[PDB]
Design a protein around this ligand. Structure first.
Ligand SMILES: *[C@@H]1O[C@H](CO)[C@@H](O[C@@H]2O[C@H](CO)[C@@H](O)[C@H](O)[C@H]2NC(C)=O)[C@H](O)[C@H]1NC(C)=O
Ligand SMILES: *[C@@H]1O[C@H](CO)[C@@H](O)[C@H](O)[C@H]1NC(C)=O
Ligand SMILES: *[C@@H]1O[C@H](CO)[C@@H](O)[C@H](O)[C@H]1NC(C)=O
Ligand SMILES: *[C@@H]1O[C@H](CO)[C@@H](O)[C@H](O)[C@H]1NC(C)=O
Ligand SMILES: *[C@@H]1O[C@H](CO)[C@@H](O)[C@H](O)[C@H]1NC(C)=O
Ligand SMILES: *[C@@H]1O[C@H](CO)[C@@H](O)[C@H](O)[C@H]1NC(C)=O
Ligand SMILES: *[C@@H]1O[C@H](CO)[C@@H](O)[C@H](O)[C@H]1NC(C)=O
Ligand SMILES: *[C@@H]1O[C@H](CO)[C@@H](O)[C@H](O)[C@H]1NC(C)=O
Ligand SMILES: *[C@@H]1O[C@H](CO)[C@@H](O)[C@H](O)[C@H]1NC(C)=O
Ligand SMILES: *[C@@H]1O[C@H](CO)[C@@H](O)[C@H](O)[C@H]1NC(C)=O
Ligand SMILES: *[C@@H]1O[C@H](CO)[C@@H](O)[C@H](O)[C@H]1NC(C)=O
Lengths: 978, 166, 147, 49, 49
């Protein structure tokens, strides 16, 4: 029967010890959740590209084991029987028998070796058979298993107990036991695949994940982690593979006479050589390529093996002779008298040079003597004449030199290769070959017409979109095959595992489904509703809900539909003094990596070849120390706005306003506040060259500036940012900060207890929100993760070849022969210098971004804190009050206290007010009415007052303004008079 | 010690930290291709290769036009391995002497240590400024009776040289 | 709603008084508007019409977004033309250097081509990062010219 | 990066892994700036609740 | 905001309550003489809300 091979097949690939590293690799591997041919009769199963074999528990013993391709002498055989505390791994052509034991342990035909001292095997023998690079591999991991019906879960990684150099082919196998229904055993497959292997603290592969199986597994593969979160992740590109190769060479079928150049042995002397023109055939290059009846076959451009694939516009076979020496002068640019006067190949030469041996054909008549490439001039002028001959009959012996000059993609190709023509196909993704235009695409018809002289078209980026197919002369367009950016809409391994897949800009026809303007999105279904966007999917459609994956039309916060009218006014009768934390970075981890040590691991050889590059590392070090001093400058500019350091009063009688969360904690040994301690907890190596310069202001020193700023804000308020600090009681400062946003101070003192309770409840809610979700303090977490990712990719560049033979420098490199050592260390110096330069460029851009945010934080703590910003929506959503810096590492967490109205009402309002035939406009506030009585009140707090001359001023009359209504305005003097 | 463990070349301290090596595994590796752990032949012991105590070198000089005493710096290094020698978080600084008094930061070393002063080079804890403990009270107000019209001059680079390398 | 819909929720305000307060907030007393409302509206609409006429015939009047779009198109076309660049590469610009070269020589020529194309793409990415820093400065300027 | 530098070819696709993670770094930078434009538009326009 | 106007931004144009600034054509740059109102000679009194 067939059962689910859950997770077996994994094993230690790289043979080296490793710890806590997710070293992804690709080998011939068993995919997860594959079908197996379990037998309760030995099925001779094809060893496709490696197989995975396991026995069952069944108690007892699995006796003996029989393997091998066919046992029929077509290949050398293979056998891994187990008996008598020995393992015969002989490759002998054993007996072909369906009922063996030593029934089939015979016929000694062409064996290798044998291994002993390994009598291995309720158990489970895990085996892997693979033949890669000609070295057969065997793996073993025997583990007891009580269950026999259903294969147990769990990850078991195998070990290379032996690495056989069998040097054979293996194309099938089986397993036949001895004789005593019967026991069972499993058989699986492998495929070219890639996994992501998670090693433990003891270098034990405790986990492994595929990626070719599940799009969720694709996300686990790309992000190089076993965990994924909210977010669409670009994985790969969905490419439609070609069906079957098509070759359309022209209708010509004759064979060109290459014998009328190569078999032509009466070459023409280099003084006046002969060039033969050839065309209109499909003559083969196989006879010249395979039969190497020559001495030198140097090809520039084409190669001897690929010559049969291309069809050429025109071929000229230059023919001349030259001595055995100076043959290297037949090369682009190579100097010499023959090259200087007789024959000079062009610098951009393209062709094959065949200096086939003529010790018997060349040899008198073959005379020899700047000039243009492919020049030709034969003439004769204490005289001087270049008439020289050579009457030879091995060092000085002349030879025969024939040069083929090809020109490609300039005209209708006329001489082709031996490849047989194949029927043309249309409207299907098919890889093609038209006169050598190798490529893959779909062939459609276009209204464009090729000119009769024209052969094939092109686009920008030298893409041959249109080619008139030869042998039919038909208009065609090489549209690229259906390609679409495949993405993943996953809800995170923490919550679910169901996955949704996106196909970027493909009509649904070409592979539920839900069409978007960004493309058809499988794995999800539309929802005729509006929920806040979770995973932006694209083109206005975005997404698990109720244990189901959805993909709906993105909500935009619904339609509030505010009620406009000529007199529609909403004045808030209540407010919430809410604190909002918009977190900003100010600095990053200073690196200042030792470039001469990073790129060159203290190698004397590498240092010279690096200083040869001319102060590259000088600029690198200067830029890195400049941005490090820039981090120090940002920290000083944001935290050190004040010179004097203020100690908070021992008695905090701040009108009921707790700052114990934000003021320094006496119990904690440091000055970090309880909210600062929460920040520090919840936000929370030295390698070659890499280092971390500690900030000038330490964490306790940065916290000391932060505490000084908080103390100045709560005791001196905003005056300490201008000059000397001025003692301000906190209720007074909050009254001033109300007065600075168009709301009268009385709101504070008449709501002092209420605002204090709101502030403290808000700060408790800030602590709770920061303690529940990382999204609250995600800003510095993201920037620190960005810096750590940059450092990790920088140090992983060490493990990158960059074109070199080995990534590691100290041992394998700086150890080659000094010339080749210089060549390979130059490849490494270029690669690592490019990696470090792109790292420092990304770091300079990131430092510019952090510097913009640091100037933002400096302008906030100079305006939000050290004053009160009239810039609406700058210090938090709402009318701003004040702010609190918090010394979070590599950033600041501002507590942007803001005034936000909550409860509204409806009133009848008029732009003006008319009394006794005379206009009256409000000095401050807006005229509104509960209905029968008109009132003016602050724009952002319903505090109605009767209208008197104090709150109104007169300008104009009651016949010019539209929208005016009458009312009565009283006298601030008549009741005083009366 | 510079070492040649059965082919591998390097330089570092060969500790004896505990690790478990599988029989087929010779040595460990870090994220890069630098071998953190190597199993010593002839003993099968575990040795965690750690790089030497390297680090940058700074100079605390007060200016040739003022003095000539030099205080070379050794950062991110314990001075247990090579004037009065002073240690801090940023490193161990020689050529300077710690002082308990708080002085303003002239030459910042790192990790709060700042530095000629009285024919000697010092290395003190940075004085963050005058510890002005403002006497706050629930009924205390400060009012300035006067002012100072001071023209603070800040300079901004608006336009660099219009270099036009062709 | 005026400005209140960004502080808290939307609080409806008739346009006359909203623009009266938008005078009051720049030192121009509100009494100007309540007497000049007709002329103010006429100048408003006439200036909108002037914008329309500048958009209909005057070129590069919207030259800033047009400029950034042209810059992006020029960068993309520069990448596309860099596809048609040699960087050496056996005097071949087609990536299909194979079907002409064996794996060793094809490898070295295509490695030169990858160095060239990777350098061009890295130049494009660096220029796009600097241009996106400029665009983000303008976007944080618009987000502060909004709100 | 795979299609730009290499396209349908696979041998240079293998060679591109040998040049470190430049493909991944560049693609991550492009995705970062794309999300950057998305959040620019959200901070400019979508700031209305 | 500070040359042809007065900036209400605290600690933006000169350390203090900014008055105005005089540009000066410094080479390849500019220099602002940020005239500022910086108080001094404080005197402590008793306050009430
Ligand atoms: C590596 O193996 C050691 C073996 O000592 C693990 O430490 C634990 O050690 C105690 C005995 O002192 C055992 O009872 C435990 O079973 C061991 N725990 C585990 C998880 O094996 C050490 O934890 C292992 N490290 C890892 C996580 O790989
Ligand atoms: C092994 O192969 C050789 C090939 O020459 C053959 O002659 C021989 O009979 C084969 N078998 C034995 C007996 O090893
Ligand atoms: C060419 O010469 C070879 C030997 O030099 C000979 O075998 C062959 O018949 C000749 N014909 C052609 C087509 O080359
Ligand atoms: C997809 O194809 C269908 C018919 O083939 C066409 O009607 C439709 O317009 C195409 N998709 C879009 C987005 O237009
Ligand atoms: C205003 O809202 C607060 C809570 O936000 C509430 O306690 C209070 O009763 C409301 N009304 C008044 C008049 O304060
Ligand atoms: C609020 O302040 C009082 C006295 O100032 C204090 O006892 C209490 O612990 C504070 N509240 C919190 C949550 O710390
Ligand atoms: C004001 O009146 C309109 C119309 O009845 C209503 O839709 C709205 O909810 C009311 N409230 C406010 C404060 O807008
Ligand atoms: C309007 O307000 C006044 C003063 O509060 C009150 O006397 C009157 O009853 C209110 N009228 C309405 C329409 O509720
Ligand atoms: C205000 O009263 C006058 C006469 O007292 C009247 O003519 C005028 O129309 C009134 N305003 C209105 C109705 O808006
Ligand atoms: C230097 O070594 C001593 C003792 O060997 C240790 O106490 C100290 O922590 C080390 N240096 C630092 C910076 O900790
Ligand atoms: C402030 O002034 C009062 C009255 O002169 C005086 O009693 C008090 O000591 C002064 N306090 C300070 C902080 O100097």
């Amino acid at each position: 029967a067939y059962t689910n091979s859950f997770t077996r097949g994994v094993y230690y690939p790289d043979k080296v010890f490793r710890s806590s590293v997710l070293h992804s690799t690709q080998d011939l591997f068993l995919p997860f959740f594959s079908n197996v041919t379990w037998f309760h009769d030995n099925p001779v199963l094809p060893f496709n590209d490696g197989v995975y074999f396991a026995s069952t528990e069944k108690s007892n013993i699995i006796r003996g084991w029989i393997f091998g391709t066919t046992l029929d002498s077509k290949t050398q055989s293979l056998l891994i029987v187990n008996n008598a505390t020995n393992v015969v791994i002989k490759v002998c052509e054993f007996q072909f028998c369906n009922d063996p034991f030593f029934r089939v342990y015979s016929s000694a035909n062409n064996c290798t070796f044998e291994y002993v001292s390994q009598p291995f095997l309720k158990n489970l023998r895990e085996f892997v058979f693979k033949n890669i690079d000609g070295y057969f591999k065997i793996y073993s991991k025997h583990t007891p298993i009580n269950l026999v019906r259903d294969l147990p879960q769990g990850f078991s990684a195998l070990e290379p107990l032996v690495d056989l150099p069998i040097g054979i082919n293996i194309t099938r196998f089986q397993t036949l036991l001895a004789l005593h229904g019967a026991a069972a055993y499993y058989v699986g497959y492998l495929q070219p695949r890639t996994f992501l292997l998670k090693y433990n603290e003891n270098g034990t592969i405790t986990d492994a994940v595929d990626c070719a199986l599940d799009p969720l597994s694709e996300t686990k593969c790309t992000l190089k982690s076993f965990t994924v979160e909210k977010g669409i992740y670009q994985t790969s590109n969905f490419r439609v593979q070609p069906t079957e190769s098509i070759v359309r060479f022209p209708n010509i079928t004759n064979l060109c006479p290459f014998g009328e150049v190569f078999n032509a042995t009466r070459f023409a002397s280099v003084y006046a050589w002969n060039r033969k023109r050839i065309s209109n055939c499909v003559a083969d290059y196989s006879v010249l390529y395979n039969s190497a009846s020559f001495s030198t076959f140097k090809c520039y451009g084409v190669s001897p093996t690929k010559l049969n694939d291309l069809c050429f516009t025109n071929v000229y076979a230059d023919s001349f002779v030259i001595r055995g020496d100076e043959v290297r002068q037949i090369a682009p640019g190579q100097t010499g008298k023959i090259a200087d006067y007789n024959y000079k190949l062009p610098d951009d030469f393209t062709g094959c040079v065949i200096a086939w041996n003529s010790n018997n054909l060349d040899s008198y008549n073959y005379l020899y003597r700047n000039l243009k490439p492919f020049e030709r001039d034969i003439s004769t002028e204490n005289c001087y004449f270049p008439l020289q001959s050579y009457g030879f009959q091995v060092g000085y012996q002349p030879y025969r030199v024939v040069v083929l000059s090809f020109e490609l993609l300039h005209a209708p190709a006329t001489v082709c290769g031996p490849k047989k023509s194949t029927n043309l196909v249309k409207n299907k993704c098919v890889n093609f070959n038209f006169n050598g235009l190798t490529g893959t695409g779909v062939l459609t018809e276009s209204n464009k017409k090729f000119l009769p002289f024209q052969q094939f078209g092109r686009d920008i980026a030298d893409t041959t979109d249109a080619v008139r197919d030869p042998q039919t002369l038909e208009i065609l367009d090489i549209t690229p095959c259906s390609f679409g950016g495949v993405s993943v809409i996953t809800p995170g391994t923490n919550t679910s595992n169901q996955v949704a897949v996106l196909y970027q800009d493909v009509n649904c026809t070409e592979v539920n489904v839900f069409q978007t303007r960004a493309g058809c999105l499988i794995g999800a279904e539309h929802v005729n509703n509006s929920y806040e966007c979770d995973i932006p999917i694209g083109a206005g459609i975005c997404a698990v809900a109720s244990q189901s994956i959805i993909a709906y039309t993105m909500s935009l916060g619904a339609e509030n539909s505010v009620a406009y009218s000529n007199n529609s006014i909403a004045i808030p009768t209540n407010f919430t003094i809410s604190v909002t934390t918009e977190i900003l970075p100010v600095s990053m981890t200073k690196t200042s990596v030792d470039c001469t040590m990073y790129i060159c691991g203290d190698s004397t050889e590498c240092s010279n070849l690096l200083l040869q590059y001319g102060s590259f590392c000088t600029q690198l070090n200067r830029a890195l120390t400049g941005i490090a001093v820039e981090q120090d400058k940002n920290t000083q500019e944001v935290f050190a706005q004040v010179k004097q350091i203020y100690k908070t009063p021992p008695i905090k009688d701040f009108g009921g306003f707790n700052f114990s969360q934000i003021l320094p904690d006496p119990s904690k040994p440091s000055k970090r506040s309880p909210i600062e301690d929460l920040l520090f907890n919840k936000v929370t190596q030295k390698f070659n060259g890499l280092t971390v310069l500690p900030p000038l202001l330490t964490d306790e020193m940065i916290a000391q500036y932060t505490s000084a700023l908080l103390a100045g804000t709560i005791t001196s308020g905003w005056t300490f940012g201008a000059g000397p600090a001025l003692q301000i009681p906190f209720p007074m400062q909050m009254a001033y900060r109300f007065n600075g946003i168009g709301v009268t101070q009385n709101v504070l003192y008449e709501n002092q207890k209420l605002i204090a309770n709101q502030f403290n409840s808000a700060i408790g809610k800030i602590q709770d929100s920061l303690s529940s979700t990382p999204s609250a303090l995600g800003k510095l977490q993201d920037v620190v993760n960005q810096n750590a990712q940059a450092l990790n990719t920088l140090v992983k560049q060490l493990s990158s070849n960059f074109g070199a033979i080995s990534s590691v420098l100290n041992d394998i490199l700086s150890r080659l022969d000094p010339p080749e050592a210089e060549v390979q260390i130059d490849r490494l110096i270029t690669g690592r210098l490019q990696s470090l330069q792109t790292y420092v460029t990304q770091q300079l851009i990131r430092a510019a971004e952090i510097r913009a945010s640091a100037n933002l934080a400096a302008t906030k703590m100079s305006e939000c804190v050290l004053g009160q910003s009239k810039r609406v929506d700058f210090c938090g959503k709402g009318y701003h009050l004040m702010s609190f810096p918090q010394s979070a590492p590599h950033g600041v967490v501002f507590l942007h206290v803001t005034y936000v109205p909550a409860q509204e009402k409806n009133f009848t309002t008029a732009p003006a007010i008319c009394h006794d035939g005379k206009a009256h406009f409000p000095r401050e506030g807006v005229f509104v009415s509960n209905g029968t009585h008109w009132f003016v009140t602050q724009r952002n707090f319903y505090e109605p007052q009767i209208i008197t001359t104090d709150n109104t001023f007169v300008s104009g009359n009651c016949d010019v303004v539209i929208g005016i209504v009458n009312n009565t305005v009283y006298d601030p003097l008549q009741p005083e008079l009366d | 010690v510079n070492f040649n463990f059965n082919g591998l070349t390097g330089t570092g301290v060969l500790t004896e930290s505990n690790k478990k090596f599988l029989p087929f595994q010779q040595f460990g590796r870090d994220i890069a291709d630098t071998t953190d752990a190597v199993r010593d032949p002839q003993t099968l012991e575990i040795l965690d290769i750690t790089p030497c105590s390297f680090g940058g070198v700074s100079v605390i000089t007060p200016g040739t036009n003022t003095s000539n005493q030099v205080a070379v710096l050794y950062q991110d290094v314990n001075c247990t391995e090579v004037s009065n020698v002073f240690q801090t978080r940023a490193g161990c600084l020689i050529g300077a002497e710690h002082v308990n008094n708080s002085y303003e930061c002239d030459i910042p070393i790192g990790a709060g240590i700042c530095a000629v002063a009285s024919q000697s080079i010092i290395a003190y804890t940075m004085s963050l400024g005058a510890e002005n403990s403002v006497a706050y009270s629930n009924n205390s107000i400060a009012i300035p009776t006067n002012f100072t019209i001071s023209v603070t001059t800040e300079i901004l680079p608006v336009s660099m040289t219009k270099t036009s390398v062709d």
